[PDB]
Amino acid sequence: MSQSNRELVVDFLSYKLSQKGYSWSQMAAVKQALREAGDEFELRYRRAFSDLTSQLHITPGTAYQSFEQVVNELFRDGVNWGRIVAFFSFGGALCVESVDKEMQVLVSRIAAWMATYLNDHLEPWIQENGGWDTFVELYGN
């Protein structure tokens, strides 16, 4: 609990810093800008995505293929920050669908598929486009 307590204080301070345009760390800044861009993307296109994520039809056996198929298609002709925010929000939708349908065990897996894809496929583009700091400055409030 010596580390749990420490983690709680940091999480809360990070949030209060952000609300006045400040940040706890460069990482904290990235998270917050990603959270806002995610919210904004979803508010704006909620209705355009209608039933679509249902239409995937997730099972523990097909979930990887579906994930893989979508993100490969999403980044087939390149990367931009909008596509990255789209990527995260999709991952968000899959995790929620998985919990809705009582497949909670898929959440941690989807998280692995997301990190791995970030490390292997998006990271080089991110670095040559200024790192995530370029994203914060652009998408942050």
């Binding site: 861009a37 904004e40 993307f41 704006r44 296109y45 355009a48 995505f49 679509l52 994520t53 239409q55 995937l56 198929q69 979508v70 993100v71 298609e73 999403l74 931009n80 920050w81 909008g82 596509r83 990255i84 925010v85 789209a86 990527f87 929000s89 999709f90 652009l138 998408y139």
Partner: peptide
């Protein structure tokens, strides 16, 4: 579907930034 229509999503949310 879902992926073209994330791509055409992400591109306008590029056009907006």
């Amino acid at each position: 579907w879902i992926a073209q229509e994330l791509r055409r999503x992400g591109d306008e949310x590029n056009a907006y930034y």
